Write a protein that binds this ligand. Structure first.
Ligand SMILES: Nc1ncnc2c1ncn2[C@@H]1O[C@H](COP(=O)(O)OP(=O)(O)O)[C@@H](O)[C@H]1O
Ligand SMILES: Nc1ncnc2c1ncn2[C@@H]1O[C@H](COP(=O)(O)OP(=O)(O)O)[C@@H](O)[C@H]1O
Lengths: 972, 980
């Protein structure tokens, strides 16, 4: 009913929109946008509305209006998941409009495509990309190609990790476009190409990227570029993105004319492909290299070029895991949309999914498929991204039971990759053993192998109690079958030496007694290690944790060690000393084997990881983080990374005048909201109060009145009438699932930089200005927006102060008055203080976000409410939410679990220590596990709480007050 | 003069070596080229040049029969680590002829020429670019042979890597040349030109336009893409300062954009021009480009009807006039010619007017003029910097004293031509103004500042700088107490002089009550902030007398927040703060969102915090955009702020590493007996019957005029030349450091690196690349099919499969190699079969380095680790080592070498050279490139060096009371004299 009311409101607004002019177009699009993205319909979609919107887009007369509405609907912080799939479905029609002969329609279309690319869940890339690639390949309108190429570029910044995996399919498309006959298209294709390459993220070839781009544009530079690439010694993994940029150059290298080049190409091919850890990766590229190699291993005289070629060929076959007769293995279809769709259709066979929800099912499949390519398999991650789409037509419990099953089956398709290859790696082995290990009749390792390379740094991992320390002890004592003797390979178990030196003994005589050389030779090295004469002569009993470690490593050098064995080396060590230890290990030139619960340490030191898997040792090239990507079961160990527990929200900020948690800090009276254009208000005669003790639950089915009440409460919509009292400095944290899904656009940052990103302007960009298109950042000219004040045209000269205006802010603005408008003597003259005026935040942010921010910054400081974004403060804050300091300041979000991302997002949401936390349907995307932790945190929250939900089970023992909207009204 | 015997012997040796050279075949070519190179680059001639030799070389390069041989000699002579300034200008003088050969029909001659140009580019003093570049630009523009163009283009590319800073300043001249070349009909030339262009853009020192570089280059190739390309850059937010490199790439595009038909393109062009150019800080930077922007903008303003496009066009025109300092009637400001070679050339010729400079030295004067012109362009003005670069060329035809006296006058006169340069502008930057004052400052009747101005922006960070004692602290105190005329009252602009507050709190008062007694809010409110800040409940309740230095600083800032401070004032805030607390302060100041003014002797702290530098100049305050490092670029005099006392110039060399079996400083660690060296092809050995010893107490002076014998003796002593006969004993682990002027000048190729990175670069392979293998080309990095070098051992052709160990051999090293035996060499069945250990053989280092450097470095590395002599390149040790040589730790790991003064660069190079803690230091003519101040410090450091010292000098003055042992070569013989 209140839901059926929504359908009507959408009709009135759409009726006004179709009539809209270039003058009022943005005003109504905004209304449609703010209303459509809220909780307005109960388990269904405004089918008729989307139908009219679709139709309107295809008609000249309304193309601009309909599309401009989409751009507003598809803003960066408020696109509702209940709407998202229906917006993406319009991209095709919109691409066509990007090729229209009419300038206005063509421009709005181009604009709308960028808006959509920046608004969708980045993980849903597989539902959007095909529309853009299909379009640019099949169109003959050059302006359309340029608009789609621009949308490709915007996507690189919006979903970098997701795009990276699509590179092998995207690069050839951009390459082909670079050869378009239209010069403008050539120019645009080259630019998008340069943009797309930002996803390679490979230090080894980075500096040659512009040289590869040029080659795509002109083959004649291939020899020149091959000659230019020969020396690149690869270190970092060779990803799909690396190949889509390398192979085409090489392929043309092989089929070159001169023997030298053919040879060079092979070297590069060889050198690069051996670094391909997964066969599925090189699979789609094999066909562009193998033939060129076979043709060469049988057409070039010189026995040098041949040997090279063969080596490459052999590498390709090994790495490619090719089969007999040069047959490329059958690619896995775990990440194919076609596959995940079959799984979801199958799981929905006994559910009657109406026609209008089919598009959603496809979206779900698309998201599921992408999560598989990104190897995101934990339960919370899936609930975070797909559940919200499913409740569009299914009930939460059914959706969740079905979802959990969908992920289990989708995950099982993930192919089991092979193991490292003991043969190839570089260098004289320090040891190469086949052995078993038993500790007190207990088998720790059976018929396993251990090969260590000189100057290489290794880390040993495994489930707690698997025998990590015992193996190390074994290596230290030479109790591994086949291990070299101490004379052949000197091992030093750092800090684990036992002796009988008196606590009186001097540091000098302590080392001397070890029979490691003369006292002169000892002082020499100790000094070189940072020791002073005073320390060398002092009693060992006085050395600190840092100096004992340094002392031990100094002894290692004098002992001429070949392998340094360390066990929890960062224990009792402060940050400067850990940093010192990291630097020393990376530069001492000696092999080291480490066991540490500090993943950050392991990442900074290890080049390889030796993991316990059953009673076998399995090698993995890379640090701990790389290790985890290749071995999921590692995320369940006892490393600093895997540590996850429950959380607590911060204490709200101090408020003067509030002595009792029952005093109202927010009180609204006779409040009413009515969209301009609607027949009657969505909510009226509203009255309510909030306090630090509030425990309110906004219950009921989605509808016009319930959502609008929410939108006025959270600051999105400005009440059309009524009084709003807000205690100075009162802050509200609005928690939506949008932030939880969209954090996937920031996997490249540390939790800390993410929090800095969200509060860049001083306010939460995720929730502030949800009613505005905030895509305006490159608007040098959009700053010339004209404001109409007292009947005169004006431009903003400055913004000086701020003050509360109901449920938002107003800003004092100084102006420039427009004179002789339209004439050759037009000018904008600065006005006097007297003519300054207060202008609502909503009318300023789109064109002057920077000035608004500078002003918000001042007011925050002037009122003592500003919290600095220091690493220390962020770490402290994140600790309360269950995140570890080292991981927050040094680890990339990419390595966090769904649950950890939940903590990070809650931390980011509560960073300003709000007095009122408003949660928007938290059970819609959080599993029982996360719901539990959140429940406790909300019970203990020292500030007010307002939970919007349908789940009564979640509200019991948590809330006590109830808000329910009936016929545009309600009573607390 | 007086005829110099050993010196005349050198002329004779070169003649014999040239005779052998002109006869060499592609087989033995490299062997004698190497001989000519190692000899020519030594101290062989006393104040003159082997004139006839250079004439023969030039005549040989122009002759088909001998072009290959002669150019290959030039190639070996121009190696990356041993090209002598005595020869350098005569080598560059041969470039035009070498270019012509790069376009020769003959396959061999053309190839050798191409290779030689690269060698020369990589061998010259980067600072002498203006002497080499013109040869290359002129050659590529007048030649019609396409292979010659490809070779020169390759040379420009190598230039970018060998002298990046110097090339960046040359971009406005280079880019147009590369662009024309891209329009060459020949398809291989267009590709090569485009590649060179792509390489040149690397001189753009920022990322503002990275994603558009390939588009801009493509645009130059196809100007019809200008309109669309202009549409693409519209979205560029220029942040970094606009330099000559950025302008050279942007202006041609914008200039065409302005002349385009569509009003939309004329408008977009203006917008980009406006945004980019208001980031120009020196009008001389944009002056040569104004003529390509002003007329178009003027024409567009008169032609366009649309008011928006008109306003945009007019706005860009006003920015151009402001930033370009354009005068009346839109006159482009007079171009300073301070950096023109013709300007510095006129200066030196005038200073040399009473000196008779022979025709054969004309090329050197011109070379000296080029170098000076570049020092000025790079704003390198200190005395030591000029002595490092120029003195060595001057002593080719002048005595050291006369050279140094003229050189110092040359520098002063040249530097004096550097233009004034208007102050810097804050207005268009981002901030509301906290203040804007016109004032004077007097302290006890002493004038600190006279009629100057001070404008501070809200939320902006400033650093105050100026010579010691100029008044920085008084100004700050003045600001805090509102004693600067027109400064806002406390109510309008609250300032907090961090940690300089005075009150009467008991040492008993708790932290909470301390803050509370200041009347800054209730106790509840205060507790809320302190906790938010990081204070625990325990600390909030404890006595203030209990806080550490770090928490007092943190408390002080917290109190500033409770007082709602608009401006924070900090005076030497890093004092009494460990690195963790200093890092915390930096972070806080950068994120507190409040304006801050800092005074600090730690330029590194200023670089991490400041956005602007307010500098005391005379009795005026001058503002500069950027942090300290950027400040020093616009104000080079600022590199002498911690100079005032003679003590900051001193340094000490490290203690040589421990050696077993050496219990006295007289114990010989190096002993040579019956030693002789004779170049193959000469009529008689250069030195013979040589005997000598070196110990940790050696204090030797290798005296005498330059010559064949003296130079060869040194070349054997330092390891470059393997003795032809005689015995050499070297104590195990004995290390020698050879300090040559070459390293001091060539560091200008690493201005981008921090001192720490520079040192890591020099010892990347565990050995010093500046002095090791000076007799080898060693420029083989992309040596992949040259590792397929065939070694003839025991009459059988072999390839190296691996190198396994090292052992001492005379004055160098031998390496145990395993081989691949060649079978059916030539046939289709040819193969390289690995041999057994029994066939391994010891091969001298000199024969392996050019083709197997990586493998050799891996062996040297293992021997260093096994002998326990290895020194890890950790930040801590590198800092500890550089501090001994008088360099600050913070500067060594965080500051770019570009910001160091000439005297500081000297400490750094000395630091690099003695990094491995040698037992002997051999200095090659130190007085030739060091000024009085550096010499004094060096003399003291040598006197205290706990290892041996060997000084190759002509100065009896510098050795008096330093050395007592004497080595003087006479007729190929030398017997040590003096005492120890
Ligand atoms: N149109 C919609 N699109 C997406 N989710 C919706 C929609 N309508 C309701 N939901 C979600 O339905 C969830 C509750 O489902 P459930 O309790 O099973 O059904 P009901 O609320 O009718 O008892 C809530 O989390 C709510 O967010
Ligand atoms: N041919 C040369 N080229 C460059 N420098 C030279 C040459 N010959 C000598 N010098 C330099 O001359 C410098 C000063 O010598 P000086 O003392 O003036 O003359 P002399 O040593 O003959 O008494 C020495 O540092 C020496 O390195």
């Amino acid at each position: 009913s209140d839901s059926q009311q929504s359908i009507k409101v959408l009709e009135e607004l759409f009726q006004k929109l179709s009539v809209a002019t270039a003058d009022n177009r943005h005003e109504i699009a905004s209304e449609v946008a703010s209303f459509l993205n809220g909780n307005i319909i109960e388990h269904d979609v405004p089918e008729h509305f989307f139908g009219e919107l679709a139709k309107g887009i295809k008609d000249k007369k309304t193309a601009a209006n309909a599309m401009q509405a989409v751009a507003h609907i598809a803003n960066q912080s408020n696109l509702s998941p209940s709407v998202e799939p229906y917006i993406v479905q319009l991209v095709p029609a919109i691409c066509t409009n990007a090729g229209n002969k009419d300038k206005e329609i063509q421009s709005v279309a181009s604009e709308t495509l960028i808006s959509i690319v920046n608004a969708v869940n980045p993980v849903a890339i597989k539902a959007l990309l095909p529309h853009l690639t299909n379009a640019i390949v099949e169109t003959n309108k050059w302006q359309e190609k340029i608009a789609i190429l621009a949308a490709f570029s915007a996507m690189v910044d919006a979903a970098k990790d997701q795009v990276a995996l699509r590179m092998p399919e995207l690069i050839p498309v951009l390459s082909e476009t670079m050869w378009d006959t239209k010069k403008e298209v050539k120019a645009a294709a080259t630019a998008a190409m340069t943009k797309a390459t930002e996803t390679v993220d490979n230090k080894d070839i980075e500096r040659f990227i512009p040289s590869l781009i040029q080659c795509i544009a002109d083959p004649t530079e291939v020899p020149e570029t091959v000659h230019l690439l020969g020396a690149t010694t690869f270190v970092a993994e060779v990803t799909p993105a690396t190949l889509s940029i390398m192979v085409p150059l090489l392929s043309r290298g092989l089929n070159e004319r001169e023997t030298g080049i053919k040879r060079k190409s092979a070297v590069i091919i060889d050198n690069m492909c051996k670094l391909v850890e997964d066969p599925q990766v090189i699979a789609p590229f094999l066909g562009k290299l193998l033939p060129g190699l076979k043709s060469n291993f049988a057409t070039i005289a010189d026995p040098e070029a041949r040997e090279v070629t063969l080596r490459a060929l052999k590498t390709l076959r090994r790495v490619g895991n090719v089969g007999e007769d040069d047959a490329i293995p059958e690619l896995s279809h775990a990440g194919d949309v076609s596959t995940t769709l079959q799984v979801v259709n199958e799981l929905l066979k006994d559910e009657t999914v109406a026609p209008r929800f089919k598009i959603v099912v496809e979206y779900i499949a698309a998201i599921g498929a992408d999560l598989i390519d990104e190897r995101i398999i934990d339960q919370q991650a899936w609930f975070t991204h797909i559940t919200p789409y499913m409740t569009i037509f299914l009930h939460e419990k059914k959706a969740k039971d079905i979802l959990d099953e969908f992920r289990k089956r989708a995950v099982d398709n993930i192919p089991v990759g092979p193991n490292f290859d003991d043969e190839e790696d570089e260098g004289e082995d320090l040891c190469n053993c086949e052995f078993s290990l038993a500790y007190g009749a207990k088998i720790l390792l059976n018929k396993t192998q251990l090969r260590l390379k000189r100057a290489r740094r290794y880390g040993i991992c495994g489930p707690n109690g698997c025998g990590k320390s015992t193996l190390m002890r074994a290596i230290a004592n030479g109790q591994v079958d086949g291990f070299p003797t101490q004379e052949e390979c000197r091992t030093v178990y750092v800090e684990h030496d036992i002796d009988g030196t008196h606590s009186d003994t001097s540091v000098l005589d302590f080392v001397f007694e070890s029979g490691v050389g003369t006292k002169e030779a000892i002082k020499d090295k100790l000094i070189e290690f940072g020791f002073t004469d005073e320390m060398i002569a002092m009693p060992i009993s006085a050395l600190s944790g840092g100096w004992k470690m340094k002392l031990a490593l100094a002894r290692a050098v004098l002992r001429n060690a070949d392998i340094l064995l360390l066990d929890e080396p960062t224990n009792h060590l402060d940050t400067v000393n850990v940093a010192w230890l990291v630097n020393y290990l990376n530069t001492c030139g000696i092999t080291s084997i480490t066991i540490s619960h500090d993943s950050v340490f392991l990442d900074n030191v290890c080049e390889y990881i030796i993991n316990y898997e059953g009673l076998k040792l399995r090698k993995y090239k890379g640090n701990f983080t790389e290790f985890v990507k290749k071995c999921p079961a590692a995320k369940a160990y006892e490393e600093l990374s895997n540590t996850d527990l429950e959380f607590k929200f911060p204490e709200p900020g101090y408020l003067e005048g509030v002595k009792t948690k029952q005093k109202a800090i927010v009180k609204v009276t006779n409040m009413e909201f009515q969209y301009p254009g609607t027949s009657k208000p969505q909510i009226t005669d509203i009255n309510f109060q909030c306090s630090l003790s509030s425990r309110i639950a906004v219950i009921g089915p989605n509808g016009a009145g319930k959502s609008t009440l929410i939108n006025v409460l959270t600051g999105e919509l400005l009440p059309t009438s009524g009084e709003v009292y807000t205690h100075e400095n009162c802050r509200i944290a609005y928690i939506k699932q949008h932030a939880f899904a969209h954090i996937e656009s920031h996997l490249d940052k540390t939790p800390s930089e993410y929090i800095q990103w969200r509060f860049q302007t001083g306010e939460d960009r995720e929730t502030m200005d949800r009613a505005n298109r905030q895509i305006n950042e490159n608007d040098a000219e959009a700053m010339n927006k004209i404001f109409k004040i007292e009947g005169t045209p004006r431009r903003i000269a400055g913004i000086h102060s701020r003050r509360k205006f109901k449920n938002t802010y107003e800003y004092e603005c100084s102006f420039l008055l427009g004179e002789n408008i339209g004439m050759k003597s037009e000018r904008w003259v600065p006005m006097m203080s007297v003519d300054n005026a207060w202008i609502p935040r909503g009318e300023l942010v789109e064109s002057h976000s920077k000035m608004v921010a500078e002003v918000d910054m001042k007011e925050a400081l002037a009122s003592g409410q500003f919290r600095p974004l220091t690493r220390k403060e962020i770490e402290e804050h994140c600790s309360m939410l269950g995140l570890d300091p080292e991981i927050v300041s040094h680890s990339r979000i990419r390595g966090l679990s769904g649950g950890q991302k939940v903590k990070l997002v809650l931390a980011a949401g509560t960073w300003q220590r709000p007095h009122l936390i408003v949660l928007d349907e938290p059970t819609n995307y959080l599993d029982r596990d996360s719901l539990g932790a959140l429940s406790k945190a909300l019970k203990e929250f020292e500030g007010g709480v307002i939970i919007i939900t349908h789940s009564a089970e979640f509200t019991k023992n948590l809330t006590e007050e109830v808000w329910a909207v009936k016929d545009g009204r309600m009573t607390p």
